[PDB]
DNA sequence: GAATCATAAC
């Protein structure tokens, strides 16, 4: 509600933090990345929330998507890593920001069940699905009951086995390399 | 003992 909530804004203004910059968006590395590659794609024109998304933003949304992919190719093309581009249903930090994150989930910043389910349940809306939603309906359909998904038991995104803890989940992920 | 959770953060 003060200063920390503005961090994203601050870091997007910071030239050192800008991995990519153009007339519409700026892309920065996630300060507490939940994987080996984790970038945030932010529009210069602030947008409050996914509930306030219209057709006007469609050309911007596609652009953010495209830009994410560029960064993924430009800085992680050599990696044989699978990526995902999408948004959190409920952001914590102010503004809407696109997540581009590698599916290894090998990062010490991933510490609790909230993180894992925020990237591995319907709480994480894919960018393509969002874009199609604004194209088809002119608005994003966000199913109710998102905060309950954050409490769901740990399930691996590759093998699909249920796991009991963040430490055992990390060790289980290690073997998928 | 270790992991998770709830909550405050001056
Ligand atoms: N100063 C910062 N610079 C860059 N990324 C940040 C900063 N502070 C927080 N973040 C990231 O912003 C994300 C929040 O996005 P969201 O979950 O969409 O609300 C988290 O993954 C944080 O790690
Ligand atoms: Zn697995």
Author numbering: 164 to 340
The authors write:
For five amenable variants (V263G, H201Q, S242N, R199H, and L248M), we successfully crystallized and determined X‐ray structures of mutant proteins as ternary complexes with RNA‐DNA and AMP. V263G: Val263 maps to the β‐strand bearing the APTX catalytic nucleophile His260 and is a hydrophobic core residue engaging in Van der Waals interactions with neighboring Leu261 (β5), Val204 (β3), Ile232 (α2), His228 (α2), Phe246 (β4), and Val190 (β2). The structure of V263G (at 2.90 Å) reveals the mutation creates a sizeable cavity in the hydrophobic core corresponding to loss of the valine side chain. The structure of V263G shows the mutation creates a large cavity in the hydrophobic core, resulted from the loss of the valine side chain. Similar to core cavitation mutants of BRCA1 (Williams et al, 2003, 2004), V263G has severe impacts on stability and temperature‐dependent activity, being ~7‐fold more impaired for deadenylation activity at 37°C compared to 22°C.
